[PDB]
Design a protein around this nucleic acid. Structure first.
Ligand SMILES: [Mg+2]
Ligand SMILES: [Mg+2]
Ligand SMILES: [Mg+2]
Ligand SMILES: [Mg+2]
Ligand SMILES: [Mg+2]
Ligand SMILES: [Mg+2]
Ligand SMILES: [Mg+2]
Ligand SMILES: [Mg+2]
Ligand SMILES: [Mg+2]
Ligand SMILES: [Mg+2]
Ligand SMILES: [Mg+2]
Ligand SMILES: [Mg+2]
Ligand SMILES: [Mg+2]
Ligand SMILES: [Mg+2]
Ligand SMILES: [Mg+2]
Ligand SMILES: [Mg+2]
Ligand SMILES: [Mg+2]
Ligand SMILES: [Mg+2]
Ligand SMILES: [Mg+2]
Ligand SMILES: [Mg+2]
Lengths: 153, 50, 107, 65
RNA sequence: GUGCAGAUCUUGGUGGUAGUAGCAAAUAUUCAAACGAGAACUUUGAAGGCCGAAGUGGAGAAGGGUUCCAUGUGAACAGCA
RNA sequence: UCCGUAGCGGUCCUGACGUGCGAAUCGGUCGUCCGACCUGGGUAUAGGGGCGAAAGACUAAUCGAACCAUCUAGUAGCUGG
């Protein structure tokens, strides 16, 4: 599958991919920007802390009306949330990348998430009912998620 | 209603029999374009006239 | 040392003060479960059905003010969880809540 | 599991409501494969389905009045 | 039937708003267990409640047409699951 | 005939709502409630016509002339390209 970014060392790099994932794209982008510079153990621990509301995802671009928490000050930001479903989906995908690395025989504890990006999947359609006999869209915003690990010691 | 007539019940019988999905083996055919049954009907959505 | 049971009394009347009428008995259950988590360091807290009867004995808006509660920390059974020990929380019927200390009962 | 069917058939056999039907909570899997009126009459005989008594509406207070 | 920037142009697609407005009419849920990969919402039991015989009960007419019943699934729908 | 329930209706708050539960609803307060009462089904009256205890009201969310198709690509000294 044609990836967006090629790895600098494909022997020591593994890939994972997911398409048409029923997650909010904006929450997925902000948490992937949080994951993007991390080692795999730190990323797994921080994604568990997001679901347990111990560490937050800073909302940097899509932050309109997003409330302010105390835990965002570790990121140099004021607005943060804890997207649970979005943290679990790219934890399942991170486990898939773990399983793909173990298949290639790469070292488990040296994996650093080198590339990750979130794209917009095709939007799927439902319908809501408004006043004065008007019917409005109830569109979902699913996402494609892409990541590449790299042995970085 | 439960007080049907014979012609109405027979019309309902035919419209019951046309409301089944396509068989699985028809889209292994050579000159085939049908993906699914597009003439399907649900009792809540489309109210069949009458 | 790890498997220990002892009896406390819980003042629901100070753990309850301020919440509305339709949430007083569920808030009393959550406060009993929170007290059990704080006093026995296990996140797995199981409350007895008789204790649920005792809290909900009057109704949803008049919870009993004090209640006598036996905590029993026990080893977890099969399907080994991240929790290693759990806390069984038991009603103890009593007449008066006068001069009842924290009593360390023994098996 | 799911005992929606068993309570309905037990109510119909006992000629009471579903309000009064008591299924055994310990023997759930043995009631869960009954799926018939004839095999549910057996479990009523065996005591795994019990018709609960009527909730008490005492008349003694207004008799006293 | 030959060149578009406009005609509250036509059709189709996509943005900011915006992860915002909102998911607030009719008193209310709680504990334990089972099935399961997964349980605030399924099932069972124990409670606490409501409808309170002009009922949130039991049956019909009109209308609907398989929605009835059994089993399986959890892709899409059932505005959380 | 009076108070008043079910039913029928809709005064006031010019309350709620007003991208609403709703293209007319909801709450309290109200009018009437044995008669010019309420209501189902059947049937009759059709558009310059019906029907009207009469408001130009109603006649399928359409009424000082309903709706559908055609004449019709009606005409415009007027507006926009
Ligand atoms: Mg911004
Ligand atoms: Mg704003
Ligand atoms: Mg709406
Ligand atoms: Mg409408
Ligand atoms: Mg309908
Ligand atoms: Mg030409
Ligand atoms: Mg153009
Ligand atoms: Mg909001
Ligand atoms: Mg019935
Ligand atoms: Mg009924
Ligand atoms: Mg849903
Ligand atoms: Mg009179
Ligand atoms: Mg009168
Ligand atoms: Mg007003
Ligand atoms: Mg408003
Ligand atoms: Mg509503
Ligand atoms: Mg005439
Ligand atoms: Mg009149
Ligand atoms: Mg006039
Ligand atoms: Mg002129």
């Amino acid at each position: 599958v044609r990836y967006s970014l090629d790895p600098e060392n494909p022997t020591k790099s593994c890939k994972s991919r997911g398409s048409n994932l029923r997650v909010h794209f904006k929450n997925t982008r902000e948490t992937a920007q949080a994951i993007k510079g991390m080692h795999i153990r730190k990323a797994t621990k921080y994604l568990k802390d997001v679901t347990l509301k111990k560490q937050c995802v800073p909302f940097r671009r899509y932050n309109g009306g997003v409330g302010r928490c105390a835990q965002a000050k570790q990121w140099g930001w004021t607005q943060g949330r804890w997207p649970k479903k979005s943290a679990e989906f790219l934890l399942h995908m991170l486990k898939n990348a773990e399983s793909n690395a173990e298949l290639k025989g790469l070292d488990v504890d040296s994996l650093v998430i080198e590339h990750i990006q979130v794209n917009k999947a095709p939007k799927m359609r439902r319908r809501t009912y408004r006043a004065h006999g008007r019917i409005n869209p109830y569109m979902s915003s699913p996402c494609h998620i892409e990541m590449i690990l790299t042995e970085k010691e | 209603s439960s007080h049907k007539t014979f012609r109405i019940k027979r019309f309902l019988a035919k419209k019951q029999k046309q409301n089944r999905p396509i068989p699985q083996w028809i889209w292994m055919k050579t000159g085939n374009k049908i993906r699914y049954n597009s003439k399907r009907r649900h009792w809540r959505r489309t109210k069949l006239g009458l | 040392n790890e498997v220990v049971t002892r009896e406390y009394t819980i003042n629901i009347h100070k753990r309850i003060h301020g919440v509305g009428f339709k949430k007083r008995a569920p808030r009393a259950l959550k406060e009993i479960r929170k007290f059990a988590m704080k006093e026995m360091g296990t996140p797995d807290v199981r409350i007895d059905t008789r204790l649920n009867k005792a809290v909900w004995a009057k109704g949803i808006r008049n919870v009993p003010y004090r209640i006598r509660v036996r905590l029993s920390r026990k080893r977890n059974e099969d399907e080994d969880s991240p929790n290693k020990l759990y806390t069984l929380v038991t009603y103890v019927p009593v007449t008066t809540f006068k001069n009842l200390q924290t009593v360390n009962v023994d098996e | 599991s799911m005992l929606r069917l068993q309570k309905r058939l037990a109510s119909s056999v006992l000629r009471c409501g579903k309000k009064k039907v008591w299924l055994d909570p310990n023997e759930t899997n043995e009631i869960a494969n009954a799926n018939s009126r004839q095999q549910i009459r057996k479990l009523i005989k065996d005591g795994l389905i019990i018709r609960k008594p009527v909730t008490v509406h005492s008349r003694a207070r207004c008799r006293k009045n």
